[PDB]
Design a protein around this ligand. Structure first.
Ligand SMILES: N[C@@H](Cc1c[nH]c2ccccc12)C(=O)O
Length: 397
């Protein structure tokens, strides 16, 4: 084991740092091993974890109660893994998002816990010069700086994507809302001041959000960027709705019909939706889901409005934790879909990863491990991603 070797030879850590090391290291290491990552990349990932992430995770969990109301997950776990299914039986992509913390969190010196993520990004910029911080600094200044202004629990976090051979970094900004400045207002002004050459996709999304009947029901809340050249980065605007019928999801995926030639992709999406969510196969698409009242309940989407494209791209997130019956049932639904379409070469590796992450004896009894199933429509096929919560506090061992 890579983690066993590193833990055996790297210098020992404080109580909190050692807890985070001996918890995250095995999790990330198992996920990467099941995805058949090369040994060098597992070493690199765990060395990054030991050097730049573990020292900034703050106190270790010691009870069911979290030290913050972090927006990363529902139990405020500050770490979220993700497992992207690659078509053609290729190796899955492993990513993880983290919101680092400091003792100044909540104080006047960092009221929204922003400096640790900035520090992490700059450290990574020292090790990987390929990363570009132009758009990072621009959107940070626009959305979280002293000129920026109700909070969702966090205002920023970062994500590492191990893309087999190189590392990519992503930044999520969650603006603070005021009666005069909605999150969407701030995001739109930030993108307009970003310096993009072709704002056709942003204007399409704005028209859909403002004038369309169902598009008016989406509440923008988050913006994600890639730390690459601004011409090569995506601009992902996340939007939530209390509506949950599959008809609504179907229309949002098309952006009110702006996107065409997706009927087969949408039929496969409906099949996967009912399988993962445990619904009856004859569920009318206009039926709403049984009501779940939560901060992150309802249907979630993201629009990619990156200038390279004139038409925006939509990714939908099936909220497994809120509407499925249990983690094993949803996992088998997703896995059966993948097997029916010849894309399930890594299903058993995924199940071993789930069993690694799951609180002892709760996969078939509760939800929570799998937060989202992300679906995108690529021509006739689906691009799928599983999002995973280690549940440090909801499942405190
Ligand atoms: N925790 C928030 C934000 C979030 C974290 N990871 C996500 C992945 C997809 C969509 C949203 C999120 C939520 O569940 O909504």
């Amino acid at each position: 084991s890579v983690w066993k070797t590193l833990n055996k030879w790297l210098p020992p850590l404080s109580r909190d740092k050692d807890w985070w090391w001996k918890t995250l290291g095995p999790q990330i290491n198992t996920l990467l091993t099941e995805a058949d990552y090369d040994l060098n990349e597992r070493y690199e990932a765990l060395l990054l974890l030991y050097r730049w992430v573990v020292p900034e995770m703050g106190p270790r969990p010691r009870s069911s109660v979290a030290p913050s109301k972090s927006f990363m997950t529902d139990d405020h776990s500050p770490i979220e893994y993700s497992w992207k299914w690659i078509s053609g039986n290729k190796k899955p992509e492993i990513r993880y998002a983290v919101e680092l913390v400091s003792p100044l969190a909540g104080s006047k010196q960092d009221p929204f816990n922003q400096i640790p993520t900035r520090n992490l990004v700059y450290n990574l910029a020292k090790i990987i010069p390929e990363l570009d911080l132009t758009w990072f600094e621009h959107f940070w200044h626009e959305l979280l700086g002293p000129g920026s202004p109700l909070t969702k629990g966090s205002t920023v976090f970062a994500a590492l994507e191990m893309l087999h051979g190189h590392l990519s970094v992503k930044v999520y900004f969650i603006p603070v809302e005021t009666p005069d400045f909605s999150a969407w207002h701030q995001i739109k002004h930030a993108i307009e001041a970003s310096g993009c050459p072709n704002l056709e996709a942003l204007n399409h999304v704005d028209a859909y959000l403002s004038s369309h009947d169902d598009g008016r029901q989406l509440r923008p809340f988050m913006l994600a960027i890639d730390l690459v050249e601004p011409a090569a980065s995506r601009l992902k605007i996340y939007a939530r709705s209390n509506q949950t019928s599959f008809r609504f999801v179907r229309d949002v995926m098309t952006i009110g019909g702006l996107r065409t030639d997706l009927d087969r992709s949408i039929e496969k999406f409906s099949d996967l939706w009912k399988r993962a969510l445990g619904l009856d196969p004859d569920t009318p698409p206009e039926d709403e889901l049984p009501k779940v009242d939560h901060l992150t309940s309802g249907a979630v989407f993201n629009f990619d409005v990156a200038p390279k494209s004139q038409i925006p791209e939509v990714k939908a997130y099936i909220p497994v934790r809120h509407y499925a019956n249990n983690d094993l049932q949803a996992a088998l639904g997703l896995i059966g879909y993948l097997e029916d379409h010849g894309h399930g070469g890594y299903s058993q590796s995924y199940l071993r990863g789930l069993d690694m992450l799951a609180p002892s004896g709760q996969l078939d009894q509760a939800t929570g491990v799998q937060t989202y199933f992300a679906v995108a429509c690529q021509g006739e096929d689906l691009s799928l991603t599983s999002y995973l919560n280690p549940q440090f506090y909801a499942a405190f061992q």
